[PDB]
Design a protein around this motif. Structure first.
Motif, PDB file in Angstrom:
ATOM      1  N   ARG A 222       0.826  -1.165   0.000  1.00 44.82           N
ATOM      2  CA  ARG A 222       0.000   0.000   0.000  1.00 44.82           C
ATOM      3  C   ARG A 222       0.885   1.247   0.000  1.00 44.82           C
ATOM      4  NH1 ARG A 222      -5.327   0.183   0.090  1.00 44.82           N
ATOM      5  NH2 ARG A 222      -5.493  -1.948   0.915  1.00 44.82           N
ATOM      6  N   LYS A 223       1.960   1.237   0.775  1.00 41.50           N
ATOM      7  CA  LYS A 223       2.880   2.403   0.796  1.00 41.50           C
ATOM      8  C   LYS A 223       3.505   2.643  -0.588  1.00 41.50           C
ATOM      9  N   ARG A 224       3.919   1.558  -1.207  1.00 44.04           N
ATOM     10  CA  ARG A 224       4.470   1.656  -2.544  1.00 44.04           C
ATOM     11  C   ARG A 224       3.388   2.143  -3.508  1.00 44.04           C
ATOM     12  NH1 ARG A 224       7.989  -2.953  -5.842  1.00 44.04           N
ATOM     13  NH2 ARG A 224       7.898  -1.847  -7.828  1.00 44.04           N
ATOM     14  N   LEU A 225       2.229   1.554  -3.436  1.00 47.77           N
ATOM     15  CA  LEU A 225       1.166   1.983  -4.308  1.00 47.77           C
ATOM     16  C   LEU A 225       0.847   3.500  -4.239  1.00 47.77           C
ATOM     17  CD1 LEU A 225      -1.096   1.170  -6.255  1.00 47.77           C
ATOM     18  CD2 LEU A 225      -2.504   0.741  -4.249  1.00 47.77           C
ATOM     19  N   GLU A 226       0.779   4.055  -3.034  1.00 45.63           N
ATOM     20  CA  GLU A 226       0.394   5.448  -2.861  1.00 45.63           C
ATOM     21  C   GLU A 226       1.504   6.424  -3.264  1.00 45.63           C
ATOM     22  OE1 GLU A 226      -2.503   6.166  -2.979  1.00 45.63           O
ATOM     23  OE2 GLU A 226      -3.477   4.355  -2.240  1.00 45.63           O
ATOM     24  N   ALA A 227       2.717   5.927  -3.311  1.00 47.84           N
ATOM     25  CA  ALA A 227       3.840   6.614  -3.879  1.00 47.84           C
ATOM     26  C   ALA A 227       3.935   6.400  -5.401  1.00 47.84           C
ATOM     27  CB  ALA A 227       5.116   6.115  -3.238  1.00 47.84           C
ATOM     28  N   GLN A 228       2.852   5.910  -6.036  1.00 45.62           N
ATOM     29  CA  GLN A 228       2.910   5.415  -7.450  1.00 45.62           C
ATOM     30  C   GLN A 228       4.182   4.664  -7.845  1.00 45.62           C
ATOM     31  OE1 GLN A 228       2.052   8.790  -9.880  1.00 45.62           O
ATOM     32  NE2 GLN A 228      -0.086   8.887  -9.237  1.00 45.62           N
ATOM     33  N   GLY A 229       4.620   3.751  -6.974  1.00 45.42           N
ATOM     34  CA  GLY A 229       5.798   2.965  -7.217  1.00 45.42           C
ATOM     35  C   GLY A 229       5.629   1.694  -8.026  1.00 45.42           C
ATOM     36  N   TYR A 230       4.394   1.372  -8.446  1.00 42.11           N
ATOM     37  CA  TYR A 230       4.177   0.211  -9.323  1.00 42.11           C
ATOM     38  C   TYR A 230       4.036   0.754 -10.771  1.00 42.11           C
ATOM     39  CZ  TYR A 230       3.504  -2.791  -5.116  1.00 42.11           C
ATOM     40  OH  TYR A 230       3.705  -3.452  -3.945  1.00 42.11           O
ATOM     41  N   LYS A 231       5.014   0.491 -11.630  1.00 44.94           N
ATOM     42  CA  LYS A 231       4.921   0.961 -13.073  1.00 44.94           C
ATOM     43  C   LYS A 231       3.956   0.162 -13.936  1.00 44.94           C
ATOM     44  N   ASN A 232       3.743  -1.100 -13.577  1.00 41.15           N
ATOM     45  CA  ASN A 232       2.951  -2.043 -14.363  1.00 41.15           C
ATOM     46  C   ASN A 232       2.373  -3.090 -13.398  1.00 41.15           C
ATOM     47  OD1 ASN A 232       5.132  -4.095 -14.029  1.00 41.15           O
ATOM     48  ND2 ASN A 232       6.172  -2.966 -15.634  1.00 41.15           N
ATOM     49  N   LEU A 233       1.401  -3.850 -13.883  1.00 41.87           N
ATOM     50  CA  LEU A 233       0.766  -4.898 -13.099  1.00 41.87           C
ATOM     51  C   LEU A 233       1.753  -6.045 -12.737  1.00 41.87           C
ATOM     52  CD1 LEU A 233      -1.836  -6.211 -11.908  1.00 41.87           C
ATOM     53  CD2 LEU A 233      -2.273  -7.080 -14.191  1.00 41.87           C
ATOM     54  N   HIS A 234       2.693  -6.379 -13.588  1.00 46.09           N
ATOM     55  CA  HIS A 234       3.730  -7.418 -13.272  1.00 46.09           C
ATOM     56  C   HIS A 234       4.433  -7.131 -11.911  1.00 46.09           C
ATOM     57  CE1 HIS A 234       6.491 -10.703 -14.018  1.00 46.09           C
ATOM     58  NE2 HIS A 234       7.479  -9.906 -13.647  1.00 46.09           N
ATOM     59  N   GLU A 235       4.904  -5.917 -11.748  1.00 40.86           N
ATOM     60  CA  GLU A 235       5.540  -5.500 -10.489  1.00 40.86           C
ATOM     61  C   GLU A 235       4.627  -5.677  -9.259  1.00 40.86           C
ATOM     62  OE1 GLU A 235       6.954  -1.403 -10.929  1.00 40.86           O
ATOM     63  OE2 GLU A 235       8.735  -2.067 -12.065  1.00 40.86           O
ATOM     64  N   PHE A 236       3.355  -5.335  -9.389  1.00 40.69           N
ATOM     65  CA  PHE A 236       2.354  -5.480  -8.361  1.00 40.69           C
ATOM     66  C   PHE A 236       2.148  -6.961  -8.032  1.00 40.69           C
ATOM     67  CE2 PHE A 236      -1.376  -4.053  -5.948  1.00 40.69           C
ATOM     68  CZ  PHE A 236      -2.201  -5.160  -5.993  1.00 40.69           C
TER      69      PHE A 236
END
Length: 121
Positions: A60-74
């Motif tokens: 969630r912390k990474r997500l809110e920092a827009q740290g996922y560039k693509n769904l693979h990373e997620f």
């Protein structure tokens, strides 16, 4: 540049879609077994076992920092949650079992998110 903005808008929309995915995945963990990082105070040997710990608060912390560039990373991060647990814990444990359920129930959510990510671009 106008382009950098377009790109940014796309990241932001991807972040919106992944937030919805994350919530749906986390609903499939009603016991909150995967909600927080494994406590090193309570499992002081954990890092001897698991080299890349992961949990839903960290995602969630990474997500809110827009740290996922693509769904693979997620998906990589979600798979860590499951795979770390199935290694540290034995088959007969409520923890392993919760992982298996989360993997199974999450597959469906992740199937449609991939289709939506490819579709909307």
């Amino acid at each position: 540049s106008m382009e950098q903005v377009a790109m940014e808008l796309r990241l932001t929309e991807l972040t919106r879609l992944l937030r919805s995915v994350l919530d749906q995945l986390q609903d499939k963990d009603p016991a909150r077994i995967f909600a927080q990082p494994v406590s090193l105070k309570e499992v002081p040997d954990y890092l001897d076992h698991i080299k890349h710990p992961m949990d839903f608060a960290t995602m969630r912390k990474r997500l809110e920092a827009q740290g996922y560039k693509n769904l693979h990373e997620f998906e990589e991060d979600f798979d860590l949650i499951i795979d770390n647990c199935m290694k540290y814990n034995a088959r007969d444990t409520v923890f392993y079992r919760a992982a298996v359920r989360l993997r199974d129930q999450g597959g469906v959510v992740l199937r449609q998110a991939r289709r939506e990510v490819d579709s909307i671009g």
